[PDB]
Amino acid sequence: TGCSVTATRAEEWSDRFNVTYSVSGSSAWTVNLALNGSQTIQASWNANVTGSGSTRTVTPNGSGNTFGVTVMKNGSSTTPAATCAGS
Numbered sequence: 001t002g003c004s005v006t007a008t009r010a011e012e013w014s015d016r017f018n019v020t021y022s023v024s025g026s027s028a029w030t031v032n033l034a035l036n037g038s039q040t041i042q043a044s045w046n047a048n049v050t051g052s053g054s055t056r057t058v059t060p061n062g063s064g065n066t067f068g069v070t071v072m073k074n075g076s077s078t079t080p081a082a083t084c085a086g087s
Contacts, residue, residue: 003024003084004023004024005021006020006021007022016071017077017079018068018069019068020068021033021067021069022067026065026087027064027065031047031058031084032056032058032081033056034081035054036076037074039071041071043070044068046060046064047059047063047067048061
């Protein structure tokens, strides 16, 4: 009944921090990410991240439900908020 997304900080650097988002229940989900400030992703595996504006979005390509993203500090650190939608 309803799905969720967990993001654990895997590697942390003094310039950028990676995150590990994942959803359980189904694989066809829409992981929306709300990057704070002007954060930008420079890497993504098991999922693609795109979308213009201050908000961010993620979509599955056909692999699983566990993917990671590379956020850049750029004067920030708080990870983004993921939300599963489409179940």
